[PDB]
Amino acid sequence: MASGGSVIGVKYNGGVLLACDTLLSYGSLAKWPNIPRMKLVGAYTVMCATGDYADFQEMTTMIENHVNRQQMYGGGALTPNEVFCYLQRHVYHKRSQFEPCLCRFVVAGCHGGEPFLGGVDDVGTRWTDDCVAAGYGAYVALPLLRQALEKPGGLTREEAIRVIKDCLRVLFYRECRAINKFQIADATSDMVSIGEPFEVETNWEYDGFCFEKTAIIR
């Protein structure tokens, strides 16, 4: 029961970012710290999930084969909107046979100069928005990203990267099953690229964290 933690995404003026960490856990044990959890689908789309890794692998292998074959056999390249619809009907069908896909997905892409971002949960609920998250990202990160999207005009790429890193910083401080090693995917100009892993800067040296002040008996 290898499992992945949080995923977060946000739209900016010209594209969309998706981020998560490179870790799979088994219960509390941090078992594999060097796992690429984001998967490219066709020409325009990337996906990630929180929860059971085996179910993420089965579902994404199946969708990737359908997309490559439909193109090879003469039925065109599926868009992010169509891929998302297809994913959601598969998750709902499995829920309806009492054999659920125990993951929560985030999907991002770019097609037609128009960015896409959406989530699907394990009973088949679906939504699209300017920011989306799964796992603890839904409690920790959405509040920060929703405040950054309040400014009128939208975010630049640089502002979007900066607020994404503040979110990853808080997940590392406050989510138990996490490591400080993340990747960012960028969908813009009708393609997706995945960056190299990086780490964020953290603060541990406040006066209020010192040995004397935190002592229980004085």
Added chain:
Amino acid sequence: NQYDTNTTTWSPTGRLFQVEYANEAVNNGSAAVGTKNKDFVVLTALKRSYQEKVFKLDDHVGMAIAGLVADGRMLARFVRTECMNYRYMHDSDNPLPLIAEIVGEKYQRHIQFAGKRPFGVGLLIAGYDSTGPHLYHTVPSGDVFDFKATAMGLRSQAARTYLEKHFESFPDCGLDELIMHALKALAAATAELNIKNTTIAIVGKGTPFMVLTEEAARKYL
């Protein structure tokens, strides 16, 4: 003739006779025409006591038939069902090249096995998708042709002769001249054309597949 009774018997010269005879059902149906320009497809048909010859298959696609009507209806129900499933799963129009392939494949299963009969019907399928307008003709042997203009049914050689003179000018034509070329081709396979014996149907850019009413068809007849 010892080789003309079943679909599963090759003749000594490499022919399949039952499939040639099903193809005569089509050639004795009433005539139908199709044409296309850069962004539209037009179908016209002789429907004379009204007999249904044109059918909508989804928002973006329809067809005309010639030959056995009950086989026509069985194919219409199959393609309808396929287009509904595609839209359920993808939220978009079923691509026209995939419709033409599954139809071809369904005809062929009925010419290779003794417990099935060939379909005795020809279709002109017209539609509009993300790669533009398309016009396909399908026949009982299972072949599928992709056309700029064609005609099927009784005396459809005259209609085809007329279209061979004008078709190279159709890409530049507008929707009104394209409809007129389609009626003058159907006229060559023929009493004259009124609003009570002729169907006109259209599909294209910003236009869902539709059949003109008698009001709208007055403008051209």
